[PDB]
């Protein structure tokens, strides 16, 4: 005649440190983030390392593959979708913030994206744009057909009604990945206002 009693338990939970991307992008939610035209998705994996759920969309499958490779190397999970942003369908129920890193694209696409991202992201959401400007075309080519077709940030921020802007700066810097010969370039950084939904 004998008896024995015992039990066990455990708890797994923690968070990761973070920081602003632009100036105040630390106001970006830790939730689901949609990153468009990222090319390599380096910042996408960076966001994932912050504990963020990151979806990356690009026209380049190999660029998305680079994002996947980066994610694996960083030990984080990432989602990739191959699609042209012009044809890409953003679903309203699909609540994901909008981040553009160094996305060289025609303003006409933004006009098409505007309705997509507005309906896609819940009210009070935030839109992020950071990187060189198309005006960088003045370095080499003078434009896709013309520099005149290229949007300034003042145009972009004025053409985007869905949110109010907290920050917007035009920065002067030498063009990265250019020719041997020097060459200045304009960079655009601006961030929309997020109020708790």
């Amino acid at each position: 005649m004998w008896d024995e009693r015992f039990s066990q338990s455990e708890y797994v939970y923690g968070t990761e440190p973070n920081d602003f991307l632009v100036s105040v992008a630390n106001q970006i939610p830790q939730g689901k983030i949609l990153c468009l035209a990222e090319g390599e998705g380096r910042n996408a994996c960076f966001l994932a390392s912050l504990g963020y759920e990151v979806t990356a969309v690009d026209q380049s499958s190999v660029g998305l593959a680079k994002a996947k490779q980066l994610a694996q190397e960083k030990g984080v999970k990432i989602t990739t979708v191959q699609s042209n942003l012009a044809d890409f369908d953003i679903v309203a129920d699909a609540w994901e913030g909008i981040v553009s890193i160094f996305c060289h694209l025609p303003s006409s696409l933004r006009q098409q994206l505007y309705p997509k991202v507005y309906q896609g992201l819940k009210p009070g959401g935030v839109f992020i744009l950071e990187g060189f400007a198309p005006e960088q075309l003045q370095y080499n080519t003078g434009g896709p057909k013309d520099l005149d077709l290229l949007p300034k940030l003042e145009t972009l921020q004025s053409e985007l009604p869905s949110l109010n802007w907290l920050i917007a700066n035009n920065l002067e810097r030498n063009l990265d990945e250019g020719a041997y010969h020097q060459g200045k370039a304009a960079l655009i950084q601006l961030l929309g206002q997020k109020l708790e939904h």
Side-chain angles (χ1 to χ4, degrees):
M1 296 298 291
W2 64 281
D3 202 1
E4 183 178 357
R5 295 179 181 177
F6 58 89
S7 67
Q8 63 181 3
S9 67
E10 64 184 1
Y11 182 72
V12 179
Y13 181 78
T15 64
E16 303 288 348
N18 64 7
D19 203 0
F20 66 86
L21 297 174
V22 181
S23 295
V24 297
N26 61 49
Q27 299 300 307
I28 294 169
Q30 67 270 40
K32 297 181 182 180
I33 298 172
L34 179 65
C35 298
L36 306 178
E38 295 295 295
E40 292 178 303
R42 293 175 191 276
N43 285 342
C45 288
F46 171 79
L47 291 172
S49 72
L50 303 179
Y52 304 177
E53 184 170 359
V54 178
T55 302
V57 179
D58 205 297
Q59 71 180 359
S60 174
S61 67
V62 299
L64 292 169
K66 287 178 182 179
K68 182 177 179 181
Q69 178 63 33
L70 289 168
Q72 288 177 354
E73 290 171 3
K74 296 296 182 180
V76 299
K77 180 182 178 181
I78 191 166
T79 299
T80 58
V81 179
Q82 181 186 357
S83 175
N84 187 339
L85 292 178
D87 298 312
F88 179 66
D89 183 355
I90 297 175
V91 177
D93 287 348
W95 286 356
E96 296 186 349
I98 305 300
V99 179
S100 292
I101 305 300
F102 190 20
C103 298
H104 191 291
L105 56 87
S107 63
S108 66
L109 177 58
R110 292 290 185 189
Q111 290 177 357
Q112 297 303 311
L113 288 173
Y114 279 167
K116 294 183 189 190
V117 299
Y118 184 18
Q119 290 176 357
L121 183 59
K122 70 184 180 183
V126 50
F127 298 154
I128 305 295
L129 191 153
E130 176 185 0
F132 280 90
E135 299 183 307
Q136 71 185 82
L137 287 162
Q138 74 182 356
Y139 177 75
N140 185 289
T141 65
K145 298 180 183 181
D146 192 353
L147 204 183
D148 288 348
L149 283 23
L150 307 179
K152 293 183 180 296
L153 72 90
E154 290 175 356
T155 297
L156 284 173
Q157 64 90 25
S158 67
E159 287 296 305
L160 200 157
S162 67
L163 57 72
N164 291 335
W165 297 104
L166 299 176
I167 60 173
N169 298 284
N170 185 295
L171 308 180
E172 179 182 359
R173 191 174 187 166
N174 290 337
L175 184 63
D176 288 349
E177 299 181 357
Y180 177 80
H181 194 281
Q182 288 177 68
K184 292 181 172 187
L187 297 85
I188 296 174
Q189 299 181 357
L190 68 167
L191 152 152
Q193 179 177 5
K194 174 176 179 281
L195 298 176
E196 182 179 355
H197 181 74

